[PDB]
Amino acid sequence: SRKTYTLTDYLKNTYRLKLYSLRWISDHEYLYKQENNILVFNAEYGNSSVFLENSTFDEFGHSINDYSISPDGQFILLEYNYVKQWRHSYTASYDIYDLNKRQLITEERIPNNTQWVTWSPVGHKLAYVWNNDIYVKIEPNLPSYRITWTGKEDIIYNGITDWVYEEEVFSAYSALWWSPNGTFLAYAQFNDTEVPLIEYSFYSDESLQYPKTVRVPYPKAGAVNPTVKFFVVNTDSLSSVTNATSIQITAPASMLIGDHYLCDVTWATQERISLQWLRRIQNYSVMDICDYDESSGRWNCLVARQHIEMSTTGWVGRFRPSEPHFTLDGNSFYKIISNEEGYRHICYFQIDKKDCTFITKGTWEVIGIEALTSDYLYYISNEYKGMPGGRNLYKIQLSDYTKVTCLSCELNPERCQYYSVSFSKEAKYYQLRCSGPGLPLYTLHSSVNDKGLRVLEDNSALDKMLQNVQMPSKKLDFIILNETKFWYQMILPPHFDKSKKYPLLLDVYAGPCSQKADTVFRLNWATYLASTENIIVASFDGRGSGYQGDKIMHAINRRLGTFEVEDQIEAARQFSKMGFVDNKRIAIWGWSYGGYVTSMVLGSGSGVFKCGIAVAPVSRWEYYDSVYTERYMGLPTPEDNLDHYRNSTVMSRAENFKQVEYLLIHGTADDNVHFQQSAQISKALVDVGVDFQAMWYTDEDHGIASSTAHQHIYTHMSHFIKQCFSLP
Amino acid sequence: SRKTYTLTDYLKNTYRLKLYSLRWISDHEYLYKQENNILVFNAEYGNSSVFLENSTFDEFGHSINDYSISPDGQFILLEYNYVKQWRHSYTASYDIYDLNKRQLITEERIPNNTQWVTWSPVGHKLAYVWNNDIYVKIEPNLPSYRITWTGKEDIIYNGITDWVYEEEVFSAYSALWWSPNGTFLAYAQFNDTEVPLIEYSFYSDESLQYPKTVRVPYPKAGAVNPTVKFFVVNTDSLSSVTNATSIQITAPASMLIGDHYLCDVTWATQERISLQWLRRIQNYSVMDICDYDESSGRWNCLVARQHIEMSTTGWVGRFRPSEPHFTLDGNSFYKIISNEEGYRHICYFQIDKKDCTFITKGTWEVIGIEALTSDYLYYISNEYKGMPGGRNLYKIQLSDYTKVTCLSCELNPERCQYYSVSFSKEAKYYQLRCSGPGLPLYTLHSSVNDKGLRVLEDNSALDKMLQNVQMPSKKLDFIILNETKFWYQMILPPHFDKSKKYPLLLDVYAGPCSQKADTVFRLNWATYLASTENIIVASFDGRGSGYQGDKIMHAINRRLGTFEVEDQIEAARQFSKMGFVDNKRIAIWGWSYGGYVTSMVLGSGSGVFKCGIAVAPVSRWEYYDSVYTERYMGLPTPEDNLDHYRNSTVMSRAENFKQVEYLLIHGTADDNVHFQQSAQISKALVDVGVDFQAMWYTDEDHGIASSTAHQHIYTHMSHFIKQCFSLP
Ligand SMILES: Cc1nc2c(c(-c3ccc(Cl)cc3Cl)c1CN)C(=O)N(CC(=O)N(C)C)C2
């Protein structure tokens, strides 16, 4: 083939994967944009028609960033002037556009600088957030109603998350939840008043004479947390003369006695809300079931029917308490629980009764509950073949739990072993999405007979190109250690000779519930390293990794920077055993948590590694945020777990670094893992007399993802790996 | 065999230059600290007596940072708890010890956290500064009088300088001048009210969870400067029950029409102060003569006695208008001035007369006036043998100016060509200190017939130790560009062989009025590079360099980053035509201004340099401070010099760096050249895909001089230079 997958190919996207992103607009149609025209498709028969023509906005004036369409298709939301803040948050300008007419709404427009916007679940109501305040417009051309007046920048958040919550709790900027009706609007309020600030320089354009200091409320492990309230407003009864009345649903009392989080919000029915709360020590959580009393207007949450969750071995849930999927009638739900043997399975709860019933079981885990109908529940799991890094779609029959059919396993077993799914409203149809090991494959299906209806995107175009190129293969297998199977992967150079010896790169994340050994097809830096530079690129899922049961996942509880670290080192040793690695040229690298584990590995004097790269690492767990850190570490107090906070820093290993080449890299505007963390790493290395290489990226945040920086760091890191391995 | 001068010998200071540091107490005695015993020496005959036993204060229980014995030595100040701020400023605790007894004073102590203290010129009054307010103690055990009440952290400075005055103007934290009596306290007051603050993180020990943000009033080029007022208080008439009355001296109308600085304060007599001011456009300075009115109680300056300095070619003075040296009666004074030929010489002014009269002339320069009697004026200049890089002490008979005789020229013409001096009161004796080209040599002399009295320090210890090492040698010499001489120096490896080609490191500074080609003996990094690594380290004084007259110094006027940059390049080209340099291995590097030039050079595309190092560079002149920048560049406005402010940035030249290996280094706590300057360079290089190398130093400032940082940067730069030269 002559040609390899080059650094420039990765950097420049020479070889692109086609996807198939559709948005279901009912039980049987969906939107999909062809070129830049928006099509609507009939699912059963496959015929499509143009829904919105690209030309419709050539005269709009602004470049449009995204669009959202109302449940009843009368209107369409156009998002422009998009300015990204954190990992999910951003502000933007908005226009709505009437579709029955071909006219753009000019009266009572949504404000510039809006922080969040969302239609009601049905109809064409709008709720948005602006200046930390919540507004509702019944009609798109009608004046809005102000629902809160408390909003204050960096202090009072109504209907949106502060930093920790967006990042660690809801994975979203949003904190609004319409009732299925579109009648109630629930929302959360966060109070950050006494939360300390992280302050760093942002240097901006050369033209800026003095650097700006950014100040964000950010609780580090042990520090004062934001506080939260929850409210529900009756949308229907919005007066033009009266301020609007928000009803408060206070947390359980088992929560109110100390710090706690609102971690899940789920409308069960028109008049039933489920709220899940989490104590600040995250081994204990409470689910409340709240019903609207039409007479009193209140929302009552009978103590009797709270559902309680505890862990003896760790925290609750994989990253947080699992979500409840309610049956249509609202009198019961399913939800992923860790069972008697510490494997996560689907439990079935009935609203006013004790315990729950496990409908699945086995030495493997359900990954997520995906859909629910009267006959069937649909979930993704890693049952098939006992590969914890595989995913398939299953359904179990509700009237007889022993009838579990697999919907995706045998579809095309050499190519697809990792699916996700998207169900149309009411689950009449699903799109399967296979991610590997072969090229991505998007197909439709109908629920009745689970017939495959058609192929949506088979990525044929990509395939014909890579036939020309010299691509690495991927080995998924496992080693045994004490008596546990531990899964790894190698990305192997083209024309692999196990009689030859290759430099190896241990690519680590290895953070809690991580999994770096899977069946996913990727085109990335590693592909480059293997194809062009003939470097093997390994990942190993050691203790602390996920999707294999609490025994392994919890092995690291309160004890970060130990077994997950030890195990990476041990894997490198197994990898040397296998006689196709150059035991002399082993390297290691990670981003984020991977940077922390990498640094610790390099500071353990193991002797196994020659050099490694750490990007935006944690260095000391008191520096990272409360919600994430305390989950595994508890509090940094003498009475809790300060001893291991102090004892699990990178800085304290600095002396050992003189036995390796180390490259340390961090963005200065990193709002997540603060430049501070590496600012301390280098000082400790300096103070002890160890030479090391370094690179800062000015104004880049945690993702060091701007196009120029992203090309620059992988170019810089590629040089560092080449030199280490003596590669031409 | 012999051994070599290693990286470690430098870092660990294996070979030490001894000094003889004394301070003159009278016309005939001096104080000298020896083995922590404080001794009094009689100059004439050499006999000494122990003034204070090194054993005293073994009972103190603090480390004692420094001492200060009152003029009339009844008391001694003990400085402890010293904590450094900027280059001069700091805070400390004090105690007074009564020598005329045996006890420390217990009551009315000087406060902790005091910012400045000083005795009066005679006796033992005390002036000090605490929380930005001035206090005076007539007697050490008595309570202080409060002089000002306006002091406010970061905003009003009474009796002390802000950041720019400390750094760029007075080269001192002090803004107190006692009159000769001890009768008057004169002081300045500064107002940084509207001055902008540079902000940066300080990370501190590992134990600090949240990084600190430091904030310094600091005017960048073009921005709002502090304003200043000057006051004189009478120490004698301090009423214990009435707020002391301060007399303000106003700046001349020709300064009050705009932004100006107070740039020099000198007491002429008991009743006459000289004040020099300088317009913010440093073209124009005015010396005011102020007499104390005995009846008015006030101070008057007759516009008639004003003396005005204008430079049309550049700025006034080498860095500022020169210091006036008054005759005993205060009716006349002497001053260094650039003459018509642009060379700096001694001028003679009489108070109530218009111009002045030059005491010296010729194509060399006077560096400084050192002592004045009725018979002679003593000065250092670089006349001898016409070497600008040399320094010698001269005395000029004041009754006949043709009668200039040189005092240190022929003492040891081989060993000593660079002298500095220190006279006793009334100049009966003087200590000479030569610093090169041989080991430093400290000598004492009587002035009646310029007889040498004795050797104080000959550095025989160092001499003995160096016999065992292959020291490099130092060529000093000049080349001709466009029909003018320009000097350079070359540190040459031991056993230099003009037949071989050596790699060449160019060591640069090149700031206005700088000088890197001189006759002084240094033990530093270059010395290591030449002795062990056999590298030539050369330095060159091109245009803009000082001590050679205004044609050369002022060439750079308003065009920083041009002629001094072209010229460092042309010198390197000339250095290849010398047949002992490898023109395939030529490096360049510099700190501070040296960093800016090294960067401008590596970015010029000359192709002359293989690689360079820049340490704490300026990148854009709008980033540096007003007083220094606008001195050479004017204001950054479209009416003045905006265009060349922007034509002179490093960032503009980013592209050309792909042709070179570039290492960029900077401390994150640089209060002086802010880390911003370097963060903008790296962002420039990143936006255009130039790979390069970086290193920041956590919490280090412009000096990067903490012991561990110091060692790490030079170890790091040494690797870079070595690998770049492919040295074994
Ligand atoms: C919401 C979240 N998402 C991600 C990470 C982390 C995270 C975990 C630990 C640390 Cl120390 C820092 C972060 Cl940002 C967090 C939670 N804060 C992370 O690292 N990512 C990369 C990843 O998960 N990959 C590359 C597999 C994505």
Ligand SMILES: Cc1nc2c(c(-c3ccc(Cl)cc3Cl)c1CN)C(=O)N(CC(=O)N(C)C)C2
């Ligand atoms: C008061 C002062 N003292 C020094 C320097 C500068 C200076 C000049 C230009 C720039 Cl951009 C920055 C500084 Cl800090 C200044 C005035 N700011 C400097 O650099 N030094 C090095 C030196 O004496 N050498 C290397 C010979 C010592």
